[PDB]
Amino acid sequence: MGTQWRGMGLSLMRLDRFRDSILRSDEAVKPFGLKVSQLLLSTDESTFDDIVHSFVSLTAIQIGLIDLLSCMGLRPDGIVGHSLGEVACGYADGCLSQEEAVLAAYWRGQCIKEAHLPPGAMAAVGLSWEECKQRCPPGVVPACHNSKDTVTISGPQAPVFEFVEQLRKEGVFAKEVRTGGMAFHSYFMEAIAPPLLQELKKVIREPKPRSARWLSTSIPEAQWHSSLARTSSAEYNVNNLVSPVLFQEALWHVPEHAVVLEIAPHALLQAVLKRGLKPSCTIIPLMKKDHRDNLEFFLAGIGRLHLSGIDANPNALFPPVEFPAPRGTPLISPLIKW
């Protein structure tokens, strides 16, 4: 969450695969009364102010991006999530059908809305996860161990402001991350889980195993072999919603020279991944907020994937060209140089 923007994904909707993915996702969300395509196209700022719309739109965009990448034959060797988007990881690993992921996102957003919990917000400061907890004021807990210098704290808005003032008294880098009036990964989530768990158990029918490529980020490393982490069932999603995020603890396991792709409408975690990763990793954004034309950025991402040794063919994206080619196609033999 936190990577949405006005009219995101409109440029990528011109491609056939992305549009088909969006149409399938909308058909999945049709019964409940919101259409993803209209949300994307609409321009009123209130469209993304809501939470359910933001969640559904982000999940749909990520699923469409994964479909575009899969159209080129790419299959990941690892997977990582961050707060929401663990569902996108589920789709990427085959552990959840498209309808399953979209419905899970929508129901998360719907349950969070109806909860009627008090106001909340998140602020991430330079304090380290290990040391922040001791230095954190009562009633506020570490939210996301993003990196050795970035950590998020969730809780009541007023305590967040007071601790932000205290920290700026120290001069540290503190900012209330865009949370939309609600703070996640805290005790506030304690009440939401039960109804959410029952709803999800209603939604997902047959829990399926989580492959070894997926590296969880809600269940600590000590229990990756535990029972809960074995299968991505409503229990896993509820735990992801409730507990904090061990994102930094998950990036150590990226083998050197690994190419990392940021499947997200906006590459917010690019800066975090640049310092949390090894010195020889390659990071590709795949999208930028308020870009002139996102298709060009995506194509540049695929080209930069090409430069890194990963062979991805861009022909699969566009409609095929019938053959034999028209008479007069430029000769290719002269171009080959040794």
From Swiss-Prot:
Residues engaged in binding an acyl-CoA: D149, T150, F173, R275
Post-translational modification: In adipocytes, S-nitrosylation of Fatty acid synthase occurs under physiological conditions and gradually increases during adipogenesis.
Residues modified to N6-acetyllysine: K30, K175
Compartments, as annotated in UniProt: Cytoplasm; Melanosome
Tissues where this protein is expressed: Ubiquitous. Prominent expression in brain, lung, liver and mammary gland.
Acyl and malonyl transferases, as annotated region: 1-319
Phosphoserine: residues bearing it: S227
Residues spanning the signal sequence: none
Active site: S83
Subunit composition and interactions: Homodimer which is arranged in a head to tail fashion. Interacts with CEACAM1; this interaction is insulin and phosphorylation-dependent; reduces fatty-acid synthase activity.
Role summary: Fatty acid synthetase is a multifunctional enzyme that catalyzes the de novo biosynthesis of long-chain saturated fatty acids starting from acetyl-CoA and malonyl-CoA in the presence of NADPH. This multifunctional protein contains 7 catalytic activities and a site for the binding of the prosthetic group 4'-phosphopantetheine of the acyl carrier protein ([ACP]) domain. (Microbial infection) Fatty acid synthetase activity is required for SARS coronavirus-2/SARS-CoV-2 replication.
Further comment: The relatively low beta-ketoacyl synthase activity may be attributable to the low 4'-phosphopantetheine content of the protein.
Protein name (Swiss-Prot/TrEMBL): Fatty acid synthase
